[PDB]
Amino acid sequence: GLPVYITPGSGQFMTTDDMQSPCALPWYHPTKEISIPGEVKNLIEMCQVDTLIPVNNVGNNVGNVSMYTVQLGNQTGMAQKVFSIKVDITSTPLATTLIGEIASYYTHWTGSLRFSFMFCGTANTTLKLLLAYTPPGIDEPTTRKDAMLGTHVVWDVGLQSTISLVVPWVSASHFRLTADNKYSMAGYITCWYQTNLVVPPSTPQTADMLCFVSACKDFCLRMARDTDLHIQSGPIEQ
Amino acid sequence: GLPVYITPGSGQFMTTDDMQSPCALPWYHPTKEISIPGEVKNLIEMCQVDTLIPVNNVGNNVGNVSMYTVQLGNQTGMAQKVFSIKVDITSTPLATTLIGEIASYYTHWTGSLRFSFMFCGTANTTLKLLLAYTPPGIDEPTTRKDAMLGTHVVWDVGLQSTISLVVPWVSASHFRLTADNKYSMAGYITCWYQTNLVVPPSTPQTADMLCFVSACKDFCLRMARDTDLHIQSGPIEQ
């Protein structure tokens, strides 16, 4: 018959290939597929929903919930600093986040990102923080002035309550690596006081702010790979 | 199904075959390809750019730069000779040259070739050399007259500075071998004084000439093979 030549790759097996296989159970008509509210079609979707950020990434706090709140304090001094985290989306505190947890399934990431903060303060309470995105290039800023110099957003706490800070995409390589890499260093984001936290009489003087991160329509990932954030130093029983 | 017959060659592997292979990493959309000034498409291009020739292929000179200059001297006598090299483009001094280095990647070569010379002399200085191409057939000429008899070019050093000598293609076999072969002997090229090197007062009396070789649109190679000019008597570490 057809003079054929069997090619090199032939007979192999790849955990990543698109090929057909005789279906055992011929003539089987599967249960119909009823209608079910909420079906996904793209990881992306999940990536665009803001999940909460562990940031109070500190000691005893960590195994608890607090590990999620950031109390905005006193501050005797002025123009003092709140916190910082680095943008490299696979870096505790980030990592664990619905996003992070994910990204860690792919080798490369890209686009803008969104950080949102909420005031679990009081009503009569007031404040004004300055948040900033310090692109890759230098060291996480020691001072506000130094950080205010780049990308930022002044946040006026008020009747609203949620300020969303965007993290533009600044990079040389259209794409960044999800894995820790000195090169693909995305930078830092930090928060400082613009004014203070003023509270009229008989209101607490510390209060919390929750923070979150969802994606931007910018966003996109690639090169699927097995995760980081989960070592099954098992096995698993029965 | 299809009554097939598996042919002899089947299952083999050739470092030289055009066949498809399941792509691991399905659904991957590679980084776009931005625009980049200067992209090659043919070795040829590289072959048409004149690279400098080591010719002062002599002893201590060789590991240095001088190994590139040819000083045009005194010459008490007259009608004396400068240098010679042989045309077989895979023969030190030639070989190492962008061309040579290359040709040594293929088994066969062909076409014309171009030798260019430049006067790194002075301005007030003057000279007239006679360059010649002595086709394959006899011995590199001992005397000028004997060599002037074949292909040549008288070169008048002047306001110009660069004389380019062409090496026509003379051969029996449309094609020549890149590898040393008594048969495929391309011949010799040599240079002699036509007049002298005259310099008015208080000008040096020796000066240099640089020489080069680029290809001709004639040119073409074939039968790729692994190079000569590089033995990795390694390995290579970390």
């Binding site: 018959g1 057809l2 003079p3 | 299809l2 017959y5």
Partner: peptide
């Protein structure tokens, strides 16, 4: 499927036909 004399020569072919 048929008449695909994959081979050149005629001596090589299936069992003939009937008529």
């Amino acid at each position: 499927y048929f008449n695909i004399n994959y081979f050149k020569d005629a001596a090589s072919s299936g069992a003939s036909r009937l008529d």
